[PDB]
Amino acid sequence: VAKKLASDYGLRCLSVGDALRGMLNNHPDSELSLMLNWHLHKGKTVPDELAIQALDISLMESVCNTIGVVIDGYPVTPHQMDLLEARSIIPMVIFELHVPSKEIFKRLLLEKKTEQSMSYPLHNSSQIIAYKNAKYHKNINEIRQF
Amino acid sequence: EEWLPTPITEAMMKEGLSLLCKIGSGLAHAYIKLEAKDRDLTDISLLRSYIHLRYVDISENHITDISPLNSLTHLLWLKADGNQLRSARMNELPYLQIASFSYNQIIDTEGIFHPRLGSLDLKGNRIHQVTGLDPERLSSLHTLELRGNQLESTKGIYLPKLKNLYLAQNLLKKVEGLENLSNLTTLHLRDNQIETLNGFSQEMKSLQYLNLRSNMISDLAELAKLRDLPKLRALVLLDNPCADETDYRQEALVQMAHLERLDKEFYEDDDRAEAEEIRQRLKEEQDQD
What we know:
Chain A is mainly alpha-helical.
């Protein structure tokens, strides 16, 4: 859906990784890039402040800044929701997708067909996927409430 | 043998660690590749700090053990060919989709158990025999490559999950026993030695293609036997003694019309129209019974 929106009226959508990756090219030795590397080598996977900065930096991006951006599945924790509000990264509107596990698994079986459409190895564990989805429920309930 | 101790440091991680992706929790993000193929490496103790990879190559190194990786099964693939390892004695990995350990010091099949590996390669290893090969717990293992290996008994390779196996150039004075592995789809005995069947039948029903290059085969009566396979459509007998037989490829086309390919060579399809007459001749011989 995010991609469909982005295409259909040239809108943006962002994952956190999108910004971080962009930063890597835009200057591999920027402050944020240096911190990112340092943390990565410490195994510190994305201390949230880094993503928060990268995201508001992405708001600079003229298309989004003037026109439109959407964010997918983020924040993933209430703590991120709080710190985003602290900067006041604040969507005008939010939408939520309620789905039976059966549907998710059927879609995943079609993704299994796509894996033959693909060729290079990829992470496909329905077991992990289920775990992640359950924790998505866990955090999203609180995030929605707030 | 002569090497300096070669653990690793931040500097190597800064070069190697690459491809940024959102971790097994689906929350934060991590770099997913490591690359230290050949740096005379020996130790992985720093690598433990980066459990989140999916991909590594560290082949052609002096690494003797990786057992800390047993903590890190979220990896999808590892190559560590040429390294100093002796068997796959890891935990039964829930995610290592593929690996290879060819040219290693590996001897056997210990620890080969992983539910979520599909393909493995082990050519040029010192492997001699089956040492445990679980038919079920290897629940995804579809492919194994073993060219040149020092191999021995090939019964007990009882792994229905496997599609195809490649013991080409392996030192097998004889091979044995495949009939129950219905999912068996291809074997190479390319450059092997053997002269007669060893427990093979149509019950390997998925088996579409077999290579027997340089094997001892001579008696085309074998063409009566594994003809029974429902889906075998290709063979190789190249450089076998049967290549001296006056029909050989011709007779093989008679014995199996859907033998589409032989000896690096797709068949003369109009010689199938010939071999249909020759099959009539055979039936006129055979239906005298």
